[PDB]
Amino acid sequence: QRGRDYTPSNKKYLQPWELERKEYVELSLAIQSAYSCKMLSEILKDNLYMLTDYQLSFAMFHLWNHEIPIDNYFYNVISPILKEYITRFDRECNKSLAEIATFLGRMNV
């Protein structure tokens, strides 16, 4: 957006209320529509500056729910993003941590 700085106010991780509702909803819809690791990684990397822990956990849930196979694109693009976000998590990110870990375990990566 014009004259917009996406640096988190917490200085740890971005939050949904910082972004415009339209951006959050549209990125969530794109994540839901993604049906392969390649396209999901493309979407996540393109919109990384707007990405949120909630949406990342939701992407993991979508992959698990639709049994999208985990492949080289996942391990090479998505995994670094997951590592960065999980490292930046804190106490208030318990929901995202539990969801991401549970769905990664279920997918059996």
Binding site: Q1, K22, Y24, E26, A30, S36, M39, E42, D46
Partner: protein, 218 residues
Amino acid sequence: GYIQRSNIHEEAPNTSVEAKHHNKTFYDPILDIDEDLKDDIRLYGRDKPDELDFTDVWESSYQNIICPEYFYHFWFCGIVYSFEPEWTINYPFEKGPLSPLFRGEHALRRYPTGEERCIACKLCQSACPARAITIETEPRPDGSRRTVRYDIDMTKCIYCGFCQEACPVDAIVEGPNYEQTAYLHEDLFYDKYKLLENGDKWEPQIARNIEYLINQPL
């Protein structure tokens, strides 16, 4: 608000047999015969093929000499569709499906003690899109904030439900009654007497529906 996209094309799902989510029966050779008919200029426009074939002659002869409409359609509809059970609902002895959200006839409820739930806040009057509710209130001798005149013009009111939605104490409720046919236009000028009588008569079913509606959020 918007998002940025790098790959406009949504690539087709993997067609490999080994990959998961592979459907071996998605394509049927007998049915998916599109390619044969795809290259036909008649489908794409008003033009005609360079070389007409006797297949068109046979098709035209079948369509014209032996008109297949009066047999094909007659059979398929008259003889076959008549074998399905009738869809009719015997209204006098049976009723169609309704829901607890159904908005029928307006009524005014009371607390279990018998006191009126209506306090003259006029929220329902203001929210009524059709200006069908008229309320005048005066303090009761005991001191309660109760209305002295509460009229709903059933002919002017659109059964939207805004009145019950805006009611903060569930006083005015659009109960399920819908067989409220009136022979005189004056009979549709519902008054406080009529609304309270409707509430007293229909409290059981209205309360039963309100129970489920209140419990849904929980």
